[model samples]
Target chain A: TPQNITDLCAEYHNTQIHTLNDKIFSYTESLAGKREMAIITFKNGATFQVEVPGSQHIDSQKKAIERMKDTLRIAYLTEAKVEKLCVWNNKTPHAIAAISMAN
Target chain B: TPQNITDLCAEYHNTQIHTLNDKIFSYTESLAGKREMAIITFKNGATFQVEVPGSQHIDSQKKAIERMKDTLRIAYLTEAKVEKLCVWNNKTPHAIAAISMAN
Candidate 1:
């Protein structure tokens, strides 16, 4: 089923998570005591540490998206990317949407 | 008109914009050679700047959303915010979406 996201509000130099029609997940980066790590949290609240690639800069969106894609491929075996857009929301313009999850 | 975005590929400590079915815009920041300033670009290639609020961290997503919302409100009288989500794309999970203009 295609999840129609109703809201996406959070803050981070990066912060991420999604509550789908079927499941929920969160994306966060943390350091183990001191060593930094990127973690993924599932609906069960299980946090898994992921490997950071050598290519993308860790502090920017490229790195975030790249890491996310790698994880998506690993979890669901799909190649994915984030597409940001804007739409008119009645009188006010509300920007919101879910990952199109495309090849 | 709602734009079915084809891609949202780019990197930024912070970056933004949207190419709607009706119009196109780019989000970028320039410190004015030395002074810092946030800029908005249109499909026509005209660059316009806006005022930065003191409430949010300039380098964070909060700031980006706030600025974007304010701009949309000014442009078409819409309250806008960017909502990003990831969906299943074929076998791989793809993340994408745009601002939800909510009043």
Candidate 2:
């Protein structure tokens, strides 16, 4: 059977994995020590990166989203309602936030 | 009169500004030397940041978008088609890409 993720979290060095429903997310750091790039990839083949300064851990990434939450129109993405959008410990936690819809 | 950004570009230290139509964009780096945070703000009151590793300069940010264009569903956003999506010189250039619609 295909992997069906519904509320799961995994931790790894320099990377964090999370899952929710049909979404799969992976947070990775640059091997070359570049910190301004954050790559977010989903199981549905959607991938994108943003310039984040001073976000070495997954927790920081979560905070960054929180601050921009107002301007991101994150509320408009009602289809993918957030059940538990947060980061616990330092290991890593993510299931990829839906940046795009299935148009 | 309110600032109407329509095909205007400006550059600043650690920040790149771009304008297209009513969208106003500002890219700024973290003051504490954090490299993983890239803040993008728009005139329409939408803001968001990403973890962009290895992107100290504006040029890298532009290239990141180009690479992830496939997973971004950029084609679906035909309403705001890209006229000239690029970064010229080291000064910096940008016009916030519309990530959300007027829903």
Candidate 3:
């Protein structure tokens, strides 16, 4: 199975926020190749992705991702709440492009 | 050594998807001021920035963004078995502004 990893911040009401760049998705994808990882924030702002842990234990990877996804759900909703007002112009979020290792 | 050309069809693919209100690249360094163009699209559609009669030649004066590379990738997906009950997400595309002649 492909390695899966997810993370959500506990601080801001457990919002699915990027700990570093505070993005809903993997900010590394926008680093122009400075990091290695992928995160896909759902249409509503929930983020998900595959990642490699320093350790390859299956249960550990699975557990972490589960927790992350849960918090991410919260984050997505929070974003939706904060985002409703901007829908008029059909304004897109100040989306962070997924950062990944440069091709 | 920077002058190749391309074309693509453009219909209502026009919310930034320029009839040539299109889109990229590097080299030749940022010229004088700028020749920036912006285009955005729905998460479910497709369009091209290079093809003709319907064109957006990245060719500018003092320099036409001669096509030096071949981004021959397509559809981002394909499957011949089901007649593709999928997204025509794109096959038609972007704008046509080549102002870098003074960028």
Candidate 4:
């Protein structure tokens, strides 16, 4: 089910809903919007969000992931003190599950 | 070995251990527990976790992706000042090659 998901390839282009064995679900944009979202939920019943820019299908996922990693790095570096937010498709509701470090 | 990974399709259902390109793995629950876990390991050696609520299999992946996007947004906006982590089900030792940023 888990496949090569470099980022949420919900780019504004030739994307498809490819579910890998039942784990990774690669859903395409198939729309004409200029925004997308990548939500995340953690193990500790927490949630987060990342914006997916439009005009992708070429490098949206990778770009988004890069932004995410950087954002994450910043988040940790800042220690939950500063404010940083990016919108990937403000129209739709993007959400990720709560994540917790498995002890 | 890239597929559609909407969220983590590791809902509490008839999930299985699906592997691709010998680099990624999607482990299922196949169990009857009330709470399942989804774990992720990035190539940069970053990790994350998401909770798998019971009664899934049809829309968990889609939902998870949405949720993930939201969480990411928050992290970015807040300048990565939040405590985050990952746990996965679907179920196995899930890991992703740290792409510099690829889909």
Best by TM-score: 2
Runs of candidate 2 with Cα error greater than 4 angstroms are A1-3, A10-103, B1-14, B19-65, B68-77, B80-103
lDDT of 2 by residue, B2-101 (tens): 0111111222222333322333244454535644344544455544444343344354244443322321232223332222221223422232222222
TM-score of each: 0.21, 0.27, 0.19, 0.25
- Per-prediction DockQ comes to 0.02, 0.06, 0.03, 0.04
Better of 1 and 2 by DockQ: 2
Candidate 2, residue B91: how far the Cα is off, in Å: 3.4
| Poorest stretch of ten by lDDT in candidate 1 chain B | B28-37
TM-score of model 2 relative to the true fold?
Answer: 0.27
lDDT of 3 by residue, A40-70 (tens): 3433444333232224336655455334333
Task: Quote the lDDT for B68 in model 1.
Answer: 54
lDDT score, residue A55, model 4? 46
Give the Cα-based TM-score of candidate 3 against the true structure.
0.19
**lDDT at B37, model 3:** 23
lDDT (Cα, tens digit) per residue for candidate 4, span A3-102: 2232334432332232211111111210001123333322232334443443433563645454553444333433332221223332333332111111
Model 4 DockQ vs. reference: 0.04
Task: Please identify model 3 stretches exceeding 4 Å from their true place.
Answer: A1-55, A80-103, B1-103
**Comparing chain B with the reference, what is the TM-score for each candidate?**
0.26, 0.27, 0.19, 0.28
